[PDB]
Amino acid sequence: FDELRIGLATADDIRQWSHGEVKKPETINYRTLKPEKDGLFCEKIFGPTRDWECYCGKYKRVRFKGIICERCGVEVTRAKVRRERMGHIELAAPVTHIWYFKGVPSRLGYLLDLAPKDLEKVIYFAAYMITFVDEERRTRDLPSLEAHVSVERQQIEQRRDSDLEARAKKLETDLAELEAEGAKADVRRKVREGAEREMKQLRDRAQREIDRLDEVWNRFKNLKVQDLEGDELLYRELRDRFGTYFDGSMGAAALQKRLESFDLDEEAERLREIIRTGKGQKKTRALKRLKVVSAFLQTSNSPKGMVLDCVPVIPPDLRPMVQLDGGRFATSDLNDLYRRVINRNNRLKRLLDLGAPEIIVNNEKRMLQEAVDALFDNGRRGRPVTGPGNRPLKSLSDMLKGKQGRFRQNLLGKRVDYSARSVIVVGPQLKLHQCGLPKAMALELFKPFVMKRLVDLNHAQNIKSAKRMVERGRTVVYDVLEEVIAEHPVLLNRAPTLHRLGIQAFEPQLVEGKAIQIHPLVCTAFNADFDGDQMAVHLPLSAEAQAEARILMLSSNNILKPADGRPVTMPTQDMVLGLFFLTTDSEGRSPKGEGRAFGSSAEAIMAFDAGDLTLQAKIDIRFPVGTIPPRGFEPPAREEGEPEWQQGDTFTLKTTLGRALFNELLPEDYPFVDYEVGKKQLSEIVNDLAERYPKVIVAATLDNLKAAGFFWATRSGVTVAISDIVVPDAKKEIVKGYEGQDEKVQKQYERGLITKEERTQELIAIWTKATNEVAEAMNDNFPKTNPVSMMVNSGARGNMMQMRQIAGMRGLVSNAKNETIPRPIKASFREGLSVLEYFISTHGARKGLADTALRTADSGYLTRRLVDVSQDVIIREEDCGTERGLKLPIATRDADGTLRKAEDVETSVYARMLAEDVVIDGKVIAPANVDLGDVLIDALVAHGVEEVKTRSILTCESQVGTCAMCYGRSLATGKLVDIGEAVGIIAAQSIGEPGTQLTMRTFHTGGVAGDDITQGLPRVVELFEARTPKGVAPISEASGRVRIEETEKTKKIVVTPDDGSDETAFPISKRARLLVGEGDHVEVGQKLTVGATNPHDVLRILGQRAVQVHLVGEVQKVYNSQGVSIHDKHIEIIIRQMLRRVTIIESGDAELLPGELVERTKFETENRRVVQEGGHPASGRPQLMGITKASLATESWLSAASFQETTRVLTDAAINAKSDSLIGLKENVIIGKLIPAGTGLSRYRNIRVEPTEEAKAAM
Amino acid sequence: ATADPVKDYLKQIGKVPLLNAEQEVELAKRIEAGLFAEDKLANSDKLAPKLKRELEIIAEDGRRAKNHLLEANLRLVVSLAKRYTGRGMLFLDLIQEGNLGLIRAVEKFDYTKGYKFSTYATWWIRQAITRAMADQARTIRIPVHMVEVINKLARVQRQMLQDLGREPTPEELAKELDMTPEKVIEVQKYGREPISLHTPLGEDGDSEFGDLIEDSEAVVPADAVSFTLLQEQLHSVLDTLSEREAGVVSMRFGLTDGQPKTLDEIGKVYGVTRERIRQIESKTMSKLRHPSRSQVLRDYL
Ligand SMILES: [Mg+2]
Ligand SMILES: [Zn+2]
Ligand SMILES: [Zn+2]
């Protein structure tokens, strides 16, 4: 389990694994249903089908286990041994493996210098091959064979001359006799014409016999190894004419005979020689050939296994034939493929037994080879073997691949026991850490524990009686159930589970109904909505699992979302509206009892219950001792003649009753919050509470906030009648004026003075102006009292666009294929659309639905790719010895006379760590190795700093992984990241979580294609794939003079760098936009055409820091366009995992291949060991590569096998004979060992616990 | 060399010379020449080496003529194998098995019957093709006589269906074929084709038919827990009884070991009569049959 090897399995290994020969094709008997002898499903080879029974019906008893039956040879043992015992099929003629031959040429490898079409010709029995030639023996006796050929030519010419003389005599004789007989007037001309026709035909066959002799001579003269011969007649006449000189064969046996004598070390030698000198695509050919051949040199596995003689068989359980109801049978397609191979092998053996024609034997060997190929890969070549006539049979590989393969459907993700699922309901009566399971769910989940406690409580005599009562379901079972499930957490989980908070451990609690009762305060972190969403409940089982549920997983410890550090367990739908109504100012609502002193909040509550004081009214309310005053009230303390402090003393405040209640919700140590709460300030309050109070106190305060928010939202005066939604009264006249001027334009267009396109453009412009103006009128119309504004201005639920298109006009709405109708929807949803206006609304609606479906699909795909590329990076050191960092800006866009901090400081500089101390006047403002929060950043920007050096992960160098300090504080705990936290998966999920939340598509292309770059999720995936964007913006290599060259066929730009640097020319199309000055000043910074720069050349000509900044800035500017906030360290992790590979050149002294994928640490180690040897180091360039290519090119082939290309990497590992170290997480999920992240580390599992001496002395 | 080797095989047949009557009778005479010559060579008698080489030349010519007859007759076997295609066996495999039938056919030919090769070869072609179809087409092997019985029953059932236009009762088919109706039920139960395990269910792609079936051989954890608790409780109730009674019951059903022992078998080591040992045995069964020591075992069945 330390190491998991792979390689080519030669026939010796197959025979070692095998336990017999599957000689016969049949599987089971047709009446007794017993497995056959020495055939498929054989009990002698694979093992018995029952337990400790044998085939011949004897030896049914268990006592004499491990013996061999004399009658039938079946070993008596368990029935599960048929899951692990394999045999083999002995093939009469060798066949090739379809994985290596007929694949990617990087894995075919050109090990023999043959074209793939030549292989198709040779091993599919359509063209011959010469396997061996006695070249030195052929060249030794050249004068003798030349003399024999000369003798043959001489006798050919002699017999031609004799035949010519005889034909001349015959022609003269017949001409003389037909001119002397005089049978006809011109019969001599006819016989002469016939004679000359005979002349030309016999001369033709003479030149033809000469031609075949010449062609066989020049064919034999240039015969060598690796020679093919398509024509069977030509090879036959070489065999007949010339003997024991060249050896050839037919089919895959030719490859075996070539490979047994194939000399490959000198092949690598001369191939290195042609690597050293040459030019062109020959370099690439020899490069791939040397990268494949050198695998067989260093490794000890012989290359014999590419062509095979034996075929191992799957054990019979894994290709079962199971009995069903009604007598029907169901078998796997592997049994059918094995049956086909066995039938054809038996028929080939039968043909080899007797004397058979070569065409029939060759066709039999071809169909055998094709059947073996179909067994290894059904559908790789040609029409797949269908079978029933509907679908192709699934081969071995066809279930090692894809969504139906073992890697992705049964190894990474598995079904589980002790799990349950039902719909969800909201329960406000629960705490933060409680969930309500039904009775049936809790009984079926906790059934074995219930039986154990029932036997312990002796309600049942033994286990069977306990099970009988549980199945019957008596009330004592429910009582002991309620006694059991407490102090036993369960894992709740939603199916999408987009991010880390999709699994949260609650404490179960018995409730009635058939639905899981769930705290509303946490349902937004699940993305849960109570509309039939079904949540599965998984049960942690051992002590370790429920301990990790209690400590790591509890719902009262997951306040802060790891995506941005913002609180996520304070939802907004209903409680925020209640607190808004509780704490808002009295505007538009009649304030009763406005401006009267109150002794305490109790007297105010009594007055409010009486009815003479409204909830929001500016009153002077005195507060008892211990209440902390507001942040703004401490300096404006009540004026004092003697020295006094208002910090712990009583005070009077000008605040409403509702704010006093709200500060009764918050803890006593919190300062009196004295403003409109809404949502954003509530998020800030919850963030401050989480940052400055322990977890249990924060859970209690949010539970109080939930309860009071619901209580006051019931009485908040929100409701939606149709009078509450109000249309602007000015909308009628605004629309009337705009349609009047539209009518004026329409009669203006009717005269043809303007085109249709210009009219459409100006019409959509003026109608956009109209909808913006009526939106402004709508904002100016509504008061603060109506509930729609009260639930949209409080951050509760809704945006201003929705209220704009319910009250005001719906505005402009798109057509099919992304254009705009000149006529907008002038009717509001309160007024109600007309027929066709509603039709054009449906145009946009269905496109939006299809867009969000495809968007969530591609978001899941990007999330998976990010998880693969960004995994196996884990915090593994406490601190580095480094001091280098990143120059992240802190103060930007300062005005005249003032300094302003950066706008995106909250996602970039926050939650990081300083690389070194900062000084402005010789004194440190912020110490090194501390987090950067609000107060410290405010102090720095007040002192007058412009940029800071943050110790980020891109500059982190370490012996293994990354350290905690260089990564920065974790955004999910609010503290420093613990050693072992799997930061890579958290980063990948945080990038992939708002993929469905982007909801972006290009509104209009402007009538031209290609002018607009990719937007939204396609832009993000194009950035992370390191691909060249669709809008390419070239960058000048050096500063110099740049001018345009407007060639008519294709535009052209030319930049001439100064200082004697070489001219570089960039090709640009005849497209509309180019922003560079002709004969103007240019440098490396700017871009010749506005567009997305290709980041490959950015890295090439600017540096690693510049390309890191560019990538981070681009993805963050995509994400910030929608409102989703992702911290930049999550991107920086993927970018660091992205630039790790380095491309090397001129590696003539570093003794490895130049111009491939080389790891950075390995390249540095090679440089160190070659400068230790004295040789000059090889050059190297960093290579920005995509997430997919970096995921495939990994050390552990199990992780790459679990990814997309699972056939290429398996063949690659088999050829390279690479064994993977099990450092990683996919390769530890598959095996079932503990993952090396978090609790699974070595430094945590190696603890020994013992009580102290005074502890055992006490008891 | 490309896909669809059926086309490649058909072109590999090539433009073989079709044989008019005198040509194939001359070829058959050359077959006999080669065969009788190699038969003469097979004898151990010593002849002239030149005569031996001449007979070897005749044998080579006979082998060449046998080959030429094969490539001449691959056309007829392809034309006949297509008559029985698309019935669970591949077309080229049918061609190859018909080729086996044809090489069996020509070996058993004589020129005494002045008939064409078609009317004699077609019998062996049909016989070998239907024998291979009986032997190898189905996943479960069915013997050839069962196959001919079942497809004769199928064809006469089809004749009944096209005759009276209705599905006949199995009793009518049994009495019109003179077998018992239970035999007819048995043979149409045997004549069934298995359905592949990997059939898709519907719109969903990941859900296959193979994951829906359970296995009866799978161990149930409840059953194993019940078994080990039954063993523990049986040991406990054995310890509850007297030591001598526990000893005598431990051997009567051979509880201690894997083998039970008779009353005469234990009458030597302990030394009592058959009367007394069976009396104390039946007393132990009666004592365990009392309802006091029953609830600890009645639910255990
Ligand atoms: Mg939902
Ligand atoms: Zn046996
Ligand atoms: Zn570090």
Swiss-Prot record, chain A:
GO MF terms listed in the record are: DNA binding; DNA-directed RNA polymerase activity; magnesium ion binding; zinc ion binding
CDD domains registered for this protein in UniProt: RNAP_beta'_C (cd02655), RNAP_beta'_N (cd01609)
Alphabetically, which GO biological process terms does the record hold? Answer: DNA-templated transcription
Which cofactor(s) are needed, names only?
Mg(2+); Zn(2+)
Catalysed transformations (reactions): RNA(n) + a ribonucleoside 5'-triphosphate = RNA(n+1) + diphosphate
Q: What class of enzyme is it?
A: transferase
Please name the Pfam families in this protein's record: RNA_pol_Rpb1_1, RNA_pol_Rpb1_2, RNA_pol_Rpb1_3, RNA_pol_Rpb1_4, RNA_pol_Rpb1_5
Show the segment(s) annotated as Disordered.
Answer: 379-399
Q: Name one GO cellular component term.
A: DNA-directed RNA polymerase complex
Q: Which InterPro entries match?
A: DNA-dir_RpoC_beta_prime, DNA-dir_RpoC_beta_prime_bact, RNA_pol_asu, RNA_pol_N, RNA_pol_Rpb1_1, RNA_pol_Rpb1_3, RNA_pol_Rpb1_3_sf, RNA_pol_Rpb1_4
UniProt-annotated binding residues for Mg(2+): D529, D531, D533
The EC number of this protein is: 2.7.7.6
Q: Which UniProt keywords apply?
A: DNA-directed RNA polymerase, Magnesium, Metal-binding, Nucleotidyltransferase, Transcription, Transferase, Zinc
What job does this protein perform?
A: DNA-dependent RNA polymerase catalyzes the transcription of DNA into RNA using the four ribonucleoside triphosphates as substrates.
Summarize the subunit comment. Answer: The RNAP catalytic core consists of 2 alpha, 1 beta, 1 beta' and 1 omega subunit. When a sigma factor is associated with the core the holoenzyme is formed, which can initiate transcription.
Which PANTHER family does the annotation name? DNA-DIRECTED RNA POLYMERASE, DNA-DIRECTED RNA POLYMERASE SUBUNIT BETA
- Its protein name is DNA-directed RNA polymerase subunit beta'
Species name? Streptomyces coelicolor (strain ATCC BAA-471 / A3(2) / M145)
UniProtKB/Swiss-Prot annotation, chain B:
Q: Region Sigma-70 factor domain-4: what ranges?
A: 237-290
| UniProt motif Interaction with polymerase core subunit RpoC: location | 93-96
Q: Which GO terms describe its molecular function?
A: bacterial-type RNA polymerase holo enzyme binding; DNA binding; sigma factor activity
Q: Does the keyword Membrane apply?
A: no
| Record region (Binds RNA polymerase-binding protein RbpA) | 2-138
Q: Which parts of this chain are annotated as the region Sigma-70 factor domain-3?
A: 148-224
Q: Which positions does the record tag as DNA-binding?
A: 263-282
Which residues does the annotated region (Sigma-70 factor domain-2) include? Answer: 69-139
| Keywords of the record | DNA-binding, Sigma factor, Transcription, Transcription regulation
Could you provide one GO biological process annotation from this protein's UniProt record? Answer: DNA-templated transcription initiation
GO CC, sorted alphabetically, is:
cytoplasm
Physiological role: Sigma factors are initiation factors that promote the attachment of RNA polymerase to specific initiation sites and are then released. This sigma factor is the primary sigma factor during exponential growth. Its activity is stimulated by RbpA.
Give the quaternary structure: Homotrimer (Potential). interacts transiently with the RNA polymerase core complex. Interacts with RNA polymerase-binding protein RbpA via its sigma-2 region (residues 211-347) in a free form.
Similarity remark: Belongs to the sigma-70 factor family.
Name of the protein in its database record: RNA polymerase principal sigma factor HrdB
Native species: Streptomyces coelicolor (strain ATCC BAA-471 / A3(2) / M145)
Q: Which gene encodes it?
A: hrdB
Q: Which part of the complete protein is shown?
A: 210 to 510 of 511
